[PDB]
């Protein structure tokens with residue numbers, strides 16, 4: 580589990596969104612595994628607006644933050660899980676690192692801010708849904 584809290588937005592994995600998220604929906608995209616809902620309180624996270632391909636992510640199944648090198652956002656084939664059939668997920672970045680299904684939502688960040696959240700995994704790989712192209716998170 581986990582979310583990004585930027586401005587009056589809450590960014591979560593679409594497959595983990597709650598009824599309150601769906602009832603206060605701003606934007607969702609199944610192909611990216613992302614959903615954004617509105618919040619009453621202002622959040623403290625800042626979104627990275629950069630080209631970094633190194634950063635650090637939080638792994639709840641180890642209670643640890645790990646440094647990683649990750650690929651550029653791309654269209655990657657992801658195996659079937661409890662939440663999606665086997666399909667192509669867009670704007671996904673891969674790294675070598677530990678992840679279990681409940682690790683989804685952990686933040687990946689660089690010196691510029693939040694880069695994305697854990698969305699996929701297995702066999703010593705971890706995949707992150709990028710948010711750096713969602714410029715509208717910084718306003719309105």
Ligand SMILES: Cc1nc2c(CN3C[C@@H](C(N)=O)CCC3=O)c(F)ccc2[nH]1
Pocket residue numbers: 594612657660661662663668678679680681682683698699700701702
């Ligand atoms: C064996 C294994 N499968 C893992 C998944 C699979 N997965 C893919 C998600 C997606 N975005 O398609 C939907 C939810 C989900 O559980 C992880 F996300 C993380 C670690 C994993 N280890």
Ligand SMILES: [Zn+2]
Pocket residue numbers: 627628629630631689690691692
């Ligand atoms: Zn950066």
